[PDB]
């Protein structure tokens, strides 16, 4: 309600440090700018982006306080079950903050002309706008990503209580940060909770999309 404890401050610092190490490589941004505007090249660019995110996700997750202490199989189960959710969350941040106006407009043009159906494209861009409206801080993007990743309810987890012990202090820090920075808006934490449930819907859209030149063996064996 007033301030974070030194322990909550320490926990937040490790999440923030790990979250800020990520950067879009020059090679990827140069492709969005110069490659041909065809379904083939547009899908290829997006596949490259999807693959780069998996590497970014593993490295962020490995540095989360207590992730290394979880059983090896549970570490794999958490990465598999959150990969799609963490991708759409990070993509929302880049679209609304990182990418320059023109470069983001070219990537949106590439996305909308990559052979993917509107049944997938429409909720994706609806979710991007819905995220933009909340005007989330970097602390809020970092905590939300960590909460999504450390979900104790994912399939094939053996020791769920261990993941529960890791996630509960993050929800506590996030709620406290809402009370400190938005004390005039008591429904702010609830709006952020609304994004966790909207993100869950992307597990179906993604698995249904994968069912249909679009064949990418590497990403298919990770996701499902």
């Amino acid at each position: 309600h007033m301030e974070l404890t030194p322990d909550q401050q320490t926990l937040l610092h490790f999440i923030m440090d790990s979250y800020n190490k990520q950067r879009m490589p020059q090679e990827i941004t140069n492709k969005i700018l110069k490659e041909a505007f065809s379904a083939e090249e547009n899908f290829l660019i997006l596949t490259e982006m999807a693959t780069n995110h998996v590497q970014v996700l593993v490295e962020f997750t490995k540095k989360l306080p207590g992730f290394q202490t979880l059983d090896h199989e549970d570490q794999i189960a958490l990465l598999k079950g959150s990969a799609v959710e963490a991708m759409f969350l990070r993509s929302a941040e880049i679209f609304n903050k990182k990418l320059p106006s023109g470069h983001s407009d070219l990537l949106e043009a590439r996305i909308r002309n990559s052979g993917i159906s509107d049944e997938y494209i429409t909720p994706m861009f609806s979710f991007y706008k819905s995220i933009g409206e909340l005007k989330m801080t970097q602390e809020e993007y970092a905590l939300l990503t960590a909460i999504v990743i450390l979900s104790p309810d994912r399939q094939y987890i053996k020791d769920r209580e261990a993941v529960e012990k890791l996630q509960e202090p993050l929800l506590d820090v996030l709620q406290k940060l809402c009370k400190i920075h938005q004390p005039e808006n008591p429904q702010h934490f609830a709006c952020l909770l609304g994004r966790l449930t909207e993100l869950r819907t992307f597990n179906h859209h993604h698995a249904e999309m994968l069912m249909s030149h679009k064949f990418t063996p590497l990403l298919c064996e990770i996701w499902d």
């Binding site: 590497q55 593993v58 490295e59 570490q75 794999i76 990465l79 064996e221 990770i222």
Partner: peptide, 12 residues
């Protein structure tokens, strides 16, 4: 076998 995840998780 989740060979890629296993490699990336236990790397460097």
């Amino acid at each position: 076998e989740n060979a890629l995840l296993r490699y990336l998780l236990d790397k460097d």
